[PDB]
Automatic annotation (TrEMBL), chains A, B, C, D, E, F, G, H, I, J, K, L:
Domain of life, source organism: Viruses
Pfam families on file: Phi812_tail_tube (PF26461)
InterPro entries named in the record: Phi812_tail_tube
Protein name according to UniProt: Capsid protein
């Protein structure tokens, strides 16, 4: 019941941190990875003899409510124009709210698409996707 | 609570302005961008060595209730025929309702598709999409 | 509130007229257009240099409850067989119910598909689609 | 005060007349109408800019003590089986007892449901509901 | 007034007869019917042009004090287990006590649910519901 | 205490005035308003960070005894048929009986539904509902 | 009349017996059954051609005053925790007080919910619900 | 209201007839046609110069509840095996229930797919599709 | 017993104070809170392994007799129109009548709805609802 | 009869004890449990073959008069703000007044909602709800 | 109503039999067939001249609740590994529950895919698909 | 009813075991297999002459709530980076909760994709997919 002895991670127990600063108003984060597994067959066999890895891929998606002064564009993470070429790789960290320890770390994140939504009677929604070279359970350094 | 200290942008706090004039009866606006990110691999590696940008794309979609005298066709923004070729590029601006400052600016918007809907017991719905060369957080000039 | 000063078009304020005669029991009408916009890139650029129009397309869809004596086949608009080849181009007009002025005019409409639906406990539904060479905000003549 | 100069209508001052003949033993009669009002909102305004009418609906319910020889089924106003399909539209008129002037008139009434109840020691109750197209204070059919 | 010349029916003037035998200790009986009326609207008209019938439904509910030897289960009208599949359709007739003339006749009644209740200091109540195809004022089966 | 120095308002101290004339035989009047408040949550915080307003709504309901000559239909405030489309917006004012000062003012009221009821031995009841854009304590139209 | 020749059953003439022993302090017992009757319609016929049975359901509810030593938990009929998984199906029999003949028998009863209530100045009430497969007027297990 | 003067076709007003015999338990029928319309462009034009028809197609789908003795296989319309090759072309007719006149006629229907569905607690559903060479508003002969 | 040593609180021992001033003529006040508790289940265990908190919610409702000069609108606590956007968060405090000690404190209250009612022979009733972020037994703002 | 030999429990014979101390001024306590029973059907059998348990649920509700110094908030059983996350699971025990034997024991109770009410001339009412994992007739923690 | 005279097949009236043994706990069965119909055109024609059959296909899908001792793998119908190659063709029969006569027979069924589903609080679901060379309305032998 | 005699497997009756250790907080497991069945045709035939198996495939998907200390990454089953290449093949076993006997065994499972989800007010969700060379009803050794 109490957050201390809870055995399953929940939203309030984790914080989205980028470059050592928490991300405010974060709503949902989805991370996906693909090892490019393929099956190896044989002339006189009907089942795969072995499975091998050929290509590694990874993507992390973040959704937020567009802040007035702390949105991605203001923080320099998102790019609306040619400044994307000037942007350097960044690391996205997910840490426990209690101990601040790193749970999942994304290394070399690179933006792929950036989207914003406006509606008459709803809060402004901000969406962005990144591609990371590698992921690890500890900090990069 | 009060609109002055609100930290998250909402619909009522922003205005859709085109050529210095607000857009009336605007319902929803969706903007999307693509940096064309691709992964670079190596002969003796299983993960991307680097990520590069190859193609930049951007689209802005606007939905409105068809005004009797202030719809896109009357304002000269939408084209129903060969007049599209005579239309020059236009800029779409989203500004804060309070300070009128520009939040997101679309430069060189060009129409792609134009749609209208009619129903027996519903308000006439107008939809249109544009493609912009570049986007920035400040005014073009 | 009153229909006279209403600023947004609604279903009751417009009439679907074909060849100078209103279309009865009309339920929904959807019109779509495509300008075939494409982006022009450069060898040493990452963003489109210009946008051009290459192909113009347009389609109008009409849905109705199949009348006993005033359906499309009886009026000579829809074709159930080889008579389609004998059908000449027709113009579809949408006019204000009050002033009868033309709001949107479709020129050279040509049928593409014709469908009908029958159900045990529902009204017979009639659907048809047309392709028009050009569209304008005024009458053809 | 006296009935001839009463300020408001009462139960005995109104007679339910159908097809030129009064309806006997009428216990209650509830008439309902709806205009389907909807609000129109704007991107930059929290308040609704205006209201419009999009769906008109109305119903009339009549309750009576089941007459031995002058009930709805005998008069042909109600239906129990296939005969419903042969029933023509009827008009229900509410007229002043003294002057017989029409107060509320229902045009094009169509039956929706028919209900009956039997009890060991209570008077048999007859209920029926109708749907009408338009209502007016003066008879027109 | 006298029963022989009473203006309306009452509880003791109607007998519930099933398969040629009266039903004893009947407490209540509610018959419901529905025609599934729907409105037909037009693009240019707010009011419904006409109403049509699309779904006919009807139900009859019977409540009784549970007879020691003449309850529904003993007579085979109700069902408790697999025997429901072997039950044939039955007709429920409401006839005048004096003349035995048929007033309301239900054809093709089919059981829907069967309910019973027991209490420490109240008479056992028996309830059952049936669904019939068509109803008429004259017996036909 | 005396009416002139009563601490709170009562039934007879408020007069319902429409278009400069008091409304007679008013029985009840319920005014409802809604701001559509919604909570803003954060990934790392269970509690809602702040609340914002996104959907403003309001309605006013009026109940009266059906006047013989001064009911809503006669005054043109209500509608029974096509005349609803020609009805202009009206303002409902609640004023003090003595000083006639405006207490609650409704601007841009639009009818939603109109209801009537008839009974054998009860006074005819008239009910109607309206939707207004904004409300204020001082008259402005 | 005398109990020995009473026309209908009453509260004290029926005993609730479970597993060969009467249930004491029974206050109420409601048995419900459903056959899932559905109508079969045809394209050219408004009326339902016939009715069929597709979903059989039934439930029995028992209410009692919580016995100090002979309540459901002590007898093992109810469940509070993991012991529910070990409970075998039981049969509930309603028998005549005098002749002990079986009137209503429930086969394969399975517990659905168990409820209890405590109050400062009211007798403790015990409630429980069961689901059975089939019911019959004669015991078979 | 009455079926005689109804202006919109409904399910009960039409009958599905094949080879002069009505189809029982028909639920839904959907017919689709395609004229293969294509646009003709020009070197120095941005809009289609003309529209032409290149390919004619048509399909009719029928859904039914599988009859015990009058399903498609028994009638010889559907084929479960090699007998399909022996089946000759058939004509499907839709006629008004009142006058029996032909509304839509399908000529040279040929089966394409045949499907059946079975479920634990639902009526058996039968589906089949046909392809017809031509369609007309009158009988083939 | 005496008020000074009463075992439990009562109506007159609690004063509703807002912004340092007591609220007069308070009739009722209901405070609701919710933690959004959810159960965590396992594949091999029927029982819920543990419960966690995922959605915190709370509301406070206040009912009063509409003061002539000290109602919510006059004090600026409620809103009728655009002024809602300018309303700052307020705190509602429940304090002991004698010691003025804070018992229940609501922080960051935000209005949700405002309701009023008028009747011919009843005192005017004022109702309003607020949403607060967190609650505590000691004042903090 | 005498309390020492009463056949059933009553209000004063049960004491609500939490963490080894009785709960004073308890007015009501309702405990609910659910097993999520579902029926298993077969293709060829209308009746359900068997029933299984798939979702166990239970809740306990406690109502009390708000103690001045021994209410839930003071004892730390309830929560008003962030302190809910720090609350450990607690067990609620119902014991006999005389022998103190445990009758119903709730294990792992977790708060769901907390409610309070204030009125001008009524005793303050305190309500709270808890969710527990398993229940037993003997204490185990 | 009764199963004997029912005109439409239902689930309970049919049994899924494989190799002379009924399939228990069957939920849904879906069979599909394709005749590979194609249209034949002509140089100087706009409509198909004839329709021919080019390829015959058929598939039957069966869904069940995974039995502990009578699932497909135990019966030798489904294969989890290389034993599929050892499996011989099987015939699936659907027979009337009453007369046991064959309604639809699948000849030479061959498995294509086999799937199983597991969930925390739902019954285990088993799915499998087969391909049959031919289908007939009678038994293979 | 009781778990001992239950004939259909359920979630609580099975355990997800990997490398001899149960998997905690498992929510759903889906396994799919494909035999690559293809039809063999003949020049002078319209139906497949025989069916053969050409390719064997299999996939198992597991969903869990991300444990703080027992998630896949901690157990060494999932890989967030280059450590995937160091991971050896693993076997996933599904066993009966009662007898611990193996029901379905997956041999040589190899990871394909790994995903995690984060949300503001929902439990962290973990998803992963594996590919296995073979499956059997008994243990590998």
């Amino acid at each position: 019941a109490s957050e201390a002895k809870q055995t399953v991670h929940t939203g309030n127990t984790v914080l989205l941190m980028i470059k050592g600063k928490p991300v405010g108003r974060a709503q949902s984060a989805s991370g996906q990875r693909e090892y490019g597994t393929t099956g190896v067959y044989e002339i006189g066999s009907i089942m795969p003899q072995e499975h091998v890895y050929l290509r590694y891929e990874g993507t992390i998606t973040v959704e937020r409510l567009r802040m007035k002064k702390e949105n991605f564009a203001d923080l320099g993470y998102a790019s609306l124009g040619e400044e994307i070429l000037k942007k350097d790789i960044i690391d996205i960290l997910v840490v426990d709210n209690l101990t601040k320890q790193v749970i999942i770390s994304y290394h070399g994140c690179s933006a792929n698409n950036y989207n914003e939504t406006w509606q008459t009677n709803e809060i402004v929604t901000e969406e962005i996707e990144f591609s990371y070279l590698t992921a690890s359970d500890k900090a990069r350094t």
